[PDB]
Structure 1
Amino acid sequence: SSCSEDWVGYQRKCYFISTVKRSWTSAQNACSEHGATLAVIDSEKDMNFLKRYAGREEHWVGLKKEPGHPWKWSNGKEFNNWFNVTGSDKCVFLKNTEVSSMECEKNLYWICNKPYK
């Protein structure tokens, strides 16, 4: 099986959606304990699936920026800005209707992803 039990496989990545809310950093730490990271979004398909999978509630995904620095993925890779992040905060979240920023310390559900096995 390309993905573990309880994980969702789509476009060569395995996704997990949280059942509890935590800070961005805590969510990132939770994801890392399962070989994953806060959701990295490589394409329009990933984005549409994620907004939909997320649903009405806001969910932390793997994009955040340090003061005076470009957005960086949760796994370190550079962001090519193929999509726009609204708001003026430094951590990115999304839901079925938007992709925006929020204060990183806010407790939100989250979504992790990692490559297929």
Structure 2
Amino acid sequence: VSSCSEDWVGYQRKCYFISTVKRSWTSAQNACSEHGATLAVIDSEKDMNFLKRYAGREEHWVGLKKEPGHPWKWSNGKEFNNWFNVTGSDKCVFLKNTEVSSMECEKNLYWICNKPYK
């Protein structure tokens, strides 16, 4: 048995899936959830650097969302402590090779899921 599917990317004890189609943050989260994953949680600078580089030119949703009145929360429930900057003031976070920013959640963007190694 192996830690990740052959069509997922394994890095630093997490398996990643990068989508081939664009959908809303909520639909993407649902799609990750169908595969025992969440929209990507980023634990380290290593994880961030890998994610931004690979994302490339195109915006990709990741597992971070900010609701007015609540702290920033990762999709696995872990509170986010703002160790990286997120520009803009929209609820849903995306990244790409040159930015980590925010956009309206209903916008159709590519996405990235992750889950622990099996």
Q: What SS does structure 1 have at the residue aligned with 2:108?
A: coil
CA distance in 1, matches of 2:37, 2:61: 14
For structure 1, which segment, 91-100 or 71-80, has the greater mean C-alpha deviation from structure 2 after superposition? 71-80
Provide structure 1 residue ranges, at least 5 long, that are not aligned to the other structure: none
Deviations 1:60-116 (A, max 9, x none): 000001122221001111102111111110100000111000001100000000000
CA displacement at 1:2 relative to structure 2: 1.7
Structure 1 distance, partners of 2:54, 2:72, is: 23
Identity across the alignment (%) = 100
Give the SS at the match of 1:114.
Answer: strand
Q: Give the Cα–Cα distance (whole angstroms) in 1 for the partners of residues 70 and 88 of structure 2.
A: 16
CA RMSD of aligned residues (A): 0.7
So what's the TM-score if we normalise by structure 2? 0.96
CA distance in 1 between partners of 2:72 and 2:54 (Å): 23
Gapped runs of 5+ residues in structure 2? Answer: none
Aligned to 1:19: 20
Deviation at 1:16, TM superposition (A): 0.2
| TM-score in terms of structure 1 length | 0.97
Q: List 4+ stretches of structure 1 deviating above 6 A.
A: none
Shift in Å at residue 24 of structure 1? Answer: 0.3
Q: Give me the whole-angstrom Cα distance separating, in 2, the residues matched to 1:62 and 1:48.
A: 16
